[PDB]
Design a protein around this ligand. Structure first.
Ligand code: ADP
Lengths: 41, 49, 520, 86
RNA sequence: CAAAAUCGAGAGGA
DNA sequence: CTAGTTGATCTCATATCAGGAGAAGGAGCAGAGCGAATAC
DNA sequence: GTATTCGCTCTGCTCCTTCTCCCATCCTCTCGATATGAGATCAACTAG
């Protein structure tokens, strides 16, 4: 449930900020979502 | 706590699906069905064990 | 001489001996030959079919009808038990035919392959057993045969048996099957049969299951829903329509008056376990092995076989006058002793059947304990001696009782000489019981016969009886009518291990019929 | 939380059945002999006998049949054994 | 006269 | 020579994410050069 | 009749995607999981 911006040096994305979301009650597994920024109109 | 609840959640889901199967076959045959035969208790017992 | 549609002439004297139903059957069979399709003779056991086939073949050869001029090299697959009967009937009715046996007994005394070749080049009627076909399938299936008559072909009900695949190799379209019971366990037997005679008619096997086996079978259960019952009824009507032309099934109910048979009785006896036998049964059903089986751990064969043995007799634990298999230790044997006494005092000839060879041996020992004149036959007896023994027993009335294993005792043998029949031990396949009890009430039976089927009440035998009752219900649901009442005496589950001892159409008819089909 | 989160399974041919679960219980750990007599089992006996030190979980189910015409009846089978928890 | 299985997991030692 | 018995064998039948690196194959583009082919 | 193109071919360059192999040695221990018989043939008897 917290947003983490990482970057993989050998990669096609300049960045990627994931959020391994999960409803606090153990209702379903965590559903991750990424919000990236394509590498280097 | 969290690990064992991960197991219980999965195994309870499987109990519920199996009870659906059992209830469904006997209801399809037009007959009622007993819970105590629907609930294959060994699922949770042997899964956790 | 009887004249058929196109050119089929049978000699008049030969036609005369035939009854009405048999000549009707001959006409039907030649019509089948005209279409170039196979067929099944559904006439019940003993209505007389070898006569029908012999008459048709003799007429065809006599008619010189048009590869083959008239009759080509045929083959008759028959069980070993009736082979010399077949030869005798061919010689009696049509002695012109050359009938040569392919058997170890045989009449050749040389290489068999030479015999098959000679019969093929001689337009002879080669008779053989299923075993040679299974073994010699290479050699048999190369000679451009004409007919492949299967006597008691119901052996082929196993679709994937080696014999089945072996006999399904002959390329001729004229395939004949002789069996009064061409379905014994379930619809798959019917499927394999119509696979052999007419490969296309019913669809491929899985299609056949989905299309008829499920809607038909599942609709007969006690718990069947009314809509499902109507569905099964519809499908059964459709299937009977489909297969109608290729089964000719006359009962011994519409021909009895035109055939002058004596009366028959179907009394079923519900035996009581003896104290020792009851104790053994109670002990075994309380054992751990049955508990393991009910838990699915072990194969169900062993427990069922043990229960059958117990009910037949406490031979598991061989307990003077206490020798192995002593008659007073099994209630069925006491009742049998009583009936044998009564019938011997009544001067009647009895027929004694059993499923298992060992109980047949115990019964033989008990008969030796009595003074009754017996005469026994099982798979052990040499085949060459079997038909002579049948002739003997049908000849002299001195022999009081006749011992048989049902797997050879039934199956096309004529035992009109006997008067009384007792079925000691039931089986899973009711067709076995029907064939056994029909060994007596046949053409030529000059005395009233009565059937006595023995079941130990409240035991495994009662449950097997229920199962085979359900089986006759399934079969009659399609062979006799589609309005069969649902089986209700048992739910047929795996609680038979328990002991419960007592005490041109004008486009309007077509539309209307089709609507009727759709409103079920 | 898991039990009351699990959705009720409405199955029907017609008669329909949801099989609702609402409450749990845990009895103290117990052992049943071959005869089946429930007795209290201490950890030392479990270790010496190679058993499992566990407690039986009970849920009080509530099944309602709804076929037609408001033919509703709440069937509740109190203390329905589900499993054993270590 | 030689009697005593295999496959996975884990913890260790130098 | 020649019928009867004994064993072995075989068939059928019974219910119910925090690898990587290097080779191989095909892909798409790019231009060179030569057959004919228009055309001055 | 030779420029002149030109289309077609024929390499052949990059460039990407696919696929396939490899990961120190030796040693000790524990623990959990992973039928039954009827019948027919045939061959050797087993005697006549
Ligand atoms: N018209 C007939 N004339 C003489 N014998 C007949 C006649 N019809 C039937 N039989 C005899 O009835 C007996 C049973 O017939 P068969 O075909 O051998 O058994 P199944 O009817 O079960 O097929 C046979 O012995 C047959 O010779």
């Amino acid at each position: 449930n917290t947003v983490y911006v990482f970057a993989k040096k050998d990669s096609k994305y300049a960045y990627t900020g994931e959020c391994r979301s999960c409803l606090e009650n153990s209702s379903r597994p965590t559903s991750t979502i990424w919000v990236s920024m394509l590498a280097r109109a | 706590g969290p690990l064992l609840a991960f197991l219980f959640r999965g195994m309870f889901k499987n109990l519920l699906k199996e009870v659906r199967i059992y209830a469904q076959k006997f209801i399809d045959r037009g007959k009622d069905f007993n819970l105590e035969l629907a609930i294959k208790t060994r699922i949770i017992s042997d899964g956790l064990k | 001489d009887a004249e058929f549609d196109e050119g089929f002439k049978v000699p008049g004297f030969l036609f005369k001996k035939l009854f009405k139903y048999q000549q009707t059957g001959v006409r039907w069979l030649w019509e089948l030959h005209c279409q170039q399709a196979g067929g099944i003779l559904g006439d019940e056991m003993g209505l007389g079919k070898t006569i029908q086939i012999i008459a048709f073949l003799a007429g065809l050869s006599y008619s010189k009808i048009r590869r083959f001029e008239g009759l080509g090299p045929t083959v008759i697959v028959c069980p070993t038990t009736v082979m010399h009967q077949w030869v005798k009937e061919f010689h009696t009715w049509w002695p012109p035919f050359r009938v040569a046996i392919l058997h170890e007994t045989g009449s050749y005394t040389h290489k068999k392959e030479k015999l098959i070749r000679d019969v093929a080049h001689c337009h002879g009627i080669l008779i053989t057993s299923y075993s040679y076909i299974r073994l010699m399938q290479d050699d048999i299936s190369r000679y451009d045969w004409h007919y492949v008559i299967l006597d008691e072909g119901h052996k082929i009900r196993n679709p994937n048996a080696a014999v089945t695949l072996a006999c399904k190799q002959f390329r001729t379209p004229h395939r004949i099957i002789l069996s009064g019971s061409p379905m014994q366990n379930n619809l798959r037997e019917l499927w394999s049969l119509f696979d052999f005679i007419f490969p296309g008619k019913l669809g491929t096997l899985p299609v056949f299951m989905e299309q008829f086996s499920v809607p038909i079978t599942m609709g007969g259960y006690s718990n069947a829903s009314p809509v499902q019952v109507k569905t099964a009824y519809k499908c059964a009507c459709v299937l009977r329509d489909t297969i109608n032309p290729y089964l000719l099934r006359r009962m011994k109910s519409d021909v009895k008056m035109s055939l002058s048979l004596p009366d028959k009785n179907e009394q079923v006896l519900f035996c009581r376990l003896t104290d020792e036998q009851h104790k053994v049964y109670q002990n075994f059903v309380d054992s751990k092995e049955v508990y393991r089986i009910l838990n699915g751990e072990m194969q169900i064969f062993s427990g069922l076989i043990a229960l059958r043995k117990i009910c037949n007799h406490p031979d598991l634990f061989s307990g003077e006058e206490d020798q192995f298999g002593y008659w007073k230790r099994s209630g069925k044997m006491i009742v049998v002793e009583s009936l044998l006494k009564i019938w011997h005092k009544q001067g009647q000839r009895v027929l004694l059947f059993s499923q298992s060879r060992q109980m047949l041996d115990i019964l033989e020992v008990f008969l030796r304990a009595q003074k009754y004149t017996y005469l026994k036959m099982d798979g052990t007896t040499t085949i060459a001696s079997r038909q002579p023994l049948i002739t003997r027993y049908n000849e002299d009335t001195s022999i009081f009782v006749f011992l048989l294993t049902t797997r050879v005792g039934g199956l096309g043998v004529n035992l009109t000489g006997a008067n009384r029949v007792v079925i000691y031990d039931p089986d899973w396949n009711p067709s076995t019981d029907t064939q056994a009890r029909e060994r007596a009430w046949r053409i030529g039976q000059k005395k009233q016969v009565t059937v006595y089927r023995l079941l130990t009440a409240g035991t495994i035998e009662e449950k097997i009886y229920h199962r085979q009752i359900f089986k006759q219900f399934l079969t009659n649901r399609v062979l006799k009518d589609p309005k069969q009442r649902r089986f209700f005496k048992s739910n047929d589950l795996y609680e038979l291990f328990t002991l419960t001892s007592p005490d041109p159409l004008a486009s309007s008819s077509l539309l209307a019929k089709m609507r009727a089909r759709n409103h079920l | 939380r898991i039990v009351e989160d699990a959705p009720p399974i409405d199955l029907q041919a017609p008669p329909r059945y949801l099989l609702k679960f609402e409450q749990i219980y845990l009895s103290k750990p117990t052992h049943w002999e071959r005869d089946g007599a429930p007795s209290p089992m201490m950890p030392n006996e479990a270790r010496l006998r190679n058993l499992t030190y566990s407690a039986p979980l009970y849920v009080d189910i509530t099944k309602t049949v709804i076929k037609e015409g408001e033919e509703q009846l709440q069937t509740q089978h109190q203390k329905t054994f589900i499993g054993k928890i270590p």
